[PDB]
Design a binder for these strands. Structure first.
Ligand code: MN
Ligand code: MN
Ligand code: MN
Ligand code: NA
Ligand code: NA
Ligand code: NA
Length: 324
DNA sequence: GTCGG
DNA sequence: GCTGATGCGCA
DNA sequence: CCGACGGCGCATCAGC
């Protein structure tokens, strides 16, 4: 938080662009500026100082001058005052309500949590869950509870099949002290990039975790991806419900998978751009040599995380050093 | 909104 | 009833 | 001045 005041500003602007203006590239432009400024090891004294940073341009430098001078931004004060903008922004905080649903709701006079629960009939399954757990989903998960959650997932998965490998990635793996949710990567020897797709590989793990009442609600579920809600067991105080994502990936692509889902978000954006800046298209499933004409070769062999870094000549970075 | 064509 | 069109969330 | 900025699995539902 050397520059927390400025990064907060940029993030609020990013949010407005995505949620209200539905201008996704501006949204990303703002998050990119916020990321480069949060990594900047000095306290910013002016817009021109920030303008030296890649991702920070003319308009943001000026916004930075104003904030530094006035401690606020006029544009954001107006937005906050605007009823439509404010309400649309707010509704998107519900999991399942995006920019489109939010705007539609607001145009119909539906603009509060209260309005939402008064209109359950206009909500789909995922949005009802989102509404149901509104507060819970905005809470962080303390590492101590993440460790507890880890134990249960790994142990129930073993129970289904001793050769499954489940790895909790995301902020947890980076060693964060709180996480926004739990992301689990799942593998099994019988599922590889060749394979045949024998179904229920993921279903078996979801069913079991449901069986021990750890998973409490499903938002989406297919043969490779589960998105749902879970809760640690408790006269004592009930734990908050939490978001859990489970992804089943071909075993021979484990490391590209783990690398990607260990993140961060911006870090993986940073990784792919620089990747092509050395003749590779690193993605979530493979690393391939690229081509001037546009041909990416077959997936290079990968047997470790580090293996991936070597290819792309980045200084190795531990899970912890990947937040952006 | 920003940066490299 | 079906499905092409679109929305959502997401490292 | 201008255009690229990553893409996909899964759920819903308007328009047939
Ligand atoms: Mn997460
Ligand atoms: Mn997640
Ligand atoms: Mn279809
Ligand atoms: Na845009
Ligand atoms: Na700059
Ligand atoms: Na939302």
């Amino acid at each position: 938080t050397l520059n927390g005041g400025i990064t907060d500003m940029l993030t609020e602007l990013a949010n407005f662009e995505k949620n209200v203006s539905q201008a996704i590239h501006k949204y990303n432009a703002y998050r990119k500026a916020a990321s480069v400024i949060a990594k900047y090891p000095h306290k910013i004294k002016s817009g021109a100082e920030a303008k030296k940073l890649p991702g920070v341009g003319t308009k943001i430098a000026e916004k930075i001058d104003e904030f530094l001078a006035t401690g606020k931004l006029r544009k954001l004060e107006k937005i906050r005052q605007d009823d439509t903008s404010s309400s649309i922004n707010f509704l998107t905080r519900v999991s399942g309500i995006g920019p489109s649903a939010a705007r539609k709701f607001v145009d119909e006079g539906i603009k509060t949590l209260e309005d939402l629960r008064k209109n359950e009939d206009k909500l789909n399954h995922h949005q009802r869950i989102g509404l149901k757990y509104f507060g819970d989903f905005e809470k962080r998960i303390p590492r101590e509870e993440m460790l507890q959650m880890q134990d249960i997932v790994l142990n129930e998965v073993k129970k289904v099949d001793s050769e499954y490998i489940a790895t909790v990635c995301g902020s947890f793996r980076r060693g964060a002290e709180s996480s926004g949710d739990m992301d689990v990567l799942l593998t099994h020897p019988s599922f590889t990039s060749e394979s045949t797709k024998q179904p229920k590989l993921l279903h078996q793990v979801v069913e079991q975790l449901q069986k021990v009442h750890f998973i409490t609600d499903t938002l989406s579920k297919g043969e490779t991806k589960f998105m749902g809600v879970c809760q640690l067991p408790s006269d004592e105080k009930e734990y908050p419900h939490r978001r859990i994502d489970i992804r089943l990936i071909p075993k021979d692509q484990y490391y590209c998978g783990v690398l990607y889902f260990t993140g961060s978000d911006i870090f993986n954006k940073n990784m792919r751009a620089h990747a092509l800046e050395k003749g590779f298209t690193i993605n979530e499933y493979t690393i391939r040599p690229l081509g001037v004409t546009g041909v990416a070769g077959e997936p290079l062999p990968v047997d470790s995380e580090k293996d991936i870094f070597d290819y792309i000549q980045w200084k190795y970075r531990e899970p912890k050093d990947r937040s952006e």
